[PDB]
Design an enzyme around this catalytic site. Structure first.
Site, PDB file in Angstrom:
ATOM      1  N   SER A  41       0.440  -6.578  13.193  1.00 19.88           N
ATOM      2  CA  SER A  41       0.816  -6.796  11.794  1.00 19.88           C
ATOM      3  C   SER A  41      -0.348  -7.054  10.858  1.00 19.88           C
ATOM      4  O   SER A  41      -0.170  -7.046   9.647  1.00 19.88           O
ATOM      5  CB  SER A  41       1.795  -7.958  11.668  1.00 19.88           C
ATOM      6  OG  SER A  41       3.070  -7.603  12.165  1.00 19.88           O
ATOM      7  N   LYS A  44      -0.863  -4.679   7.816  1.00 24.33           N
ATOM      8  CA  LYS A  44      -0.304  -4.951   6.453  1.00 24.33           C
ATOM      9  C   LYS A  44      -1.188  -5.727   5.471  1.00 24.33           C
ATOM     10  O   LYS A  44      -0.812  -5.905   4.306  1.00 24.33           O
ATOM     11  CB  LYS A  44       1.083  -5.604   6.521  1.00 24.33           C
ATOM     12  CG  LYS A  44       2.021  -4.892   7.474  1.00 24.33           C
ATOM     13  CD  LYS A  44       3.300  -5.644   7.657  1.00 24.33           C
ATOM     14  CE  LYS A  44       4.208  -4.931   8.640  1.00 24.33           C
ATOM     15  NZ  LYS A  44       3.453  -4.367   9.814  1.00 24.33           N
ATOM     16  N   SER A 107       6.046  -9.610   6.470  1.00 24.78           N
ATOM     17  CA  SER A 107       5.586  -8.405   7.177  1.00 24.78           C
ATOM     18  C   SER A 107       6.726  -7.389   7.416  1.00 24.78           C
ATOM     19  O   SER A 107       6.731  -6.695   8.418  1.00 24.78           O
ATOM     20  CB  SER A 107       4.867  -8.768   8.494  1.00 24.78           C
ATOM     21  OG  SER A 107       3.624  -9.433   8.273  1.00 24.78           O
TER      22      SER A 107
END
Length: 354
Positions: A41, A44, A107
């Site tokens: 993640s 992002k 996220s």
């Protein structure tokens, strides 16, 4: 021995980490910080950075309505299975403010596709932009393939690059950055908590950045924290255990604030030095820097900081352009130069006209 002590770095239970000073860019501690690793993640953060670079250029506003397409349909795309989601459905019209909070706080991967097609027309094009900024920030071990970081067998990044991505977020897109500190936001009757649990740590001033975990990647965190005149950023990648996620990072930051402090000896335009000039409309050039100087030095050692300079040429000759590099400023501690910055001409000196 106490003055000139070098602090031992604590053990960090993670495959890689770095700890940098945000203002000076000084690396205070590092292990395996260029090894290529699955960023999970943390991808992002670049998604966020592109969006914030678009909003900074006035391309769109927090209050603009983004219409959700089939590609951003959370339960219409099994690629999203098991992943963080806003649960967007097609033909929904969501304010930008709500979608970029989904990305940042939550996220939400569905929100990533919505925002990519909105800012860049397609996901492929948006990823174009993501890699463009990977080039412009000079990262040597980072490549993106998808807008969310799912379905990307050949994406990668590193502790160092992910730290540098956080520095850039903070530095270049500050209104985009200041969203990461928000603890909760609400979409469609459900309240959604920020997954960075270091925000709730009452000993530190954590205000970012990004958390991440997959089985392949382990636990990732990029945190940033302040202590008055000092902001640190850490990247911990491949955290091996649960809970250790936040703990290992907390170790690194606390340690950096205990043993180091950042100083600003000189700002742009302020005269550090003065030298005679030949052929000018003035008898002397004003010498300094073209960018504020921030140094990370061992905590408490500001009083012992010395600065001197060297010059490239015996003589300065007009015309001298603005921020023409004429030498080097040396910052010393214990008689040894620790940091160097260019010496530049603060104000143009053209040839004498009479």
């Amino acid at each position: 021995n106490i003055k000139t002590m070098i602090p031992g770095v604590p053990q960090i239970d993670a495959e890689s980490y770095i700890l940098i000073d945000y203002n000076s860019g000084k690396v205070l501690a590092e292990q395996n910080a260029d090894v290529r690793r699955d960023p999970a993640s943390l991808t992002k953060m670049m998604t966020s950075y592109v969006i914030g670079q678009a909003m900074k250029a006035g391309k769109f506003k927090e209050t603009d309505l983004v219409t959700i397409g089939n590609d951003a349909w959370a339960t219409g795309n099994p690629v999203f299975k098991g992943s963080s989601l806003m649960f967007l459905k097609p033909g929904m019209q969501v304010p930008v403010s709500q979608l970029i909070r989904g990305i940042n706080l939550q996220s939400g991967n569905d929100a990533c596709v919505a925002m990519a097609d909105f800012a860049a027309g397609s996901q492929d094009a948006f990823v174009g932009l993501m890699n463009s900024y990977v080039n412009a920030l000079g990262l040597k071990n980072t490549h993106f393939q998808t807008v969310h970081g799912l379905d990307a067998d050949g994406q990668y990044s590193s502790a160092r690059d992910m730290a540098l991505i956080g520095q850039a977020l903070i530095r270049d897109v500050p209104n985009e950055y200041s969203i990461y500190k928000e603890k909760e936001f609400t979409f469609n009757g459900i309240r959604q908590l920020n997954r960075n649990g270091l925000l709730w740590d009452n000993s530190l001033n954590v205000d970012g950045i990004k958390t991440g975990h997959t089985d392949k990647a382990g636990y990732n965190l990029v945190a940033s924290a302040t202590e008055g005149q000092m902001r640190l950023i850490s990247a911990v990648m491949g955290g091996r255990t649960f809970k250790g996620r936040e703990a290992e990072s907390k170790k690194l930051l606390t340690w950096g604030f205990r043993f180091f402090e950042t100083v600003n000896p000189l700002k742009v335009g302020k005269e550090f030095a003065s030298e005679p000039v030949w052929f000018g409309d003035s008898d002397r050039a004003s010498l300094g820097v073209d960018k504020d100087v921030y140094l990370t030095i061992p905590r408490g050692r500001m009083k012992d900081l010395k600065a001197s300079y060297v010059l490239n040429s015996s003589e300065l000759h007009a015309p001298l352009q603005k921020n023409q590099v004429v030498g080097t400023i040396n910052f010393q501690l214990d008689g040894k130069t620790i940091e160097q910055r260019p010496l530049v001409v603060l104000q143009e000196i053209p040839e004498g006209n009479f």
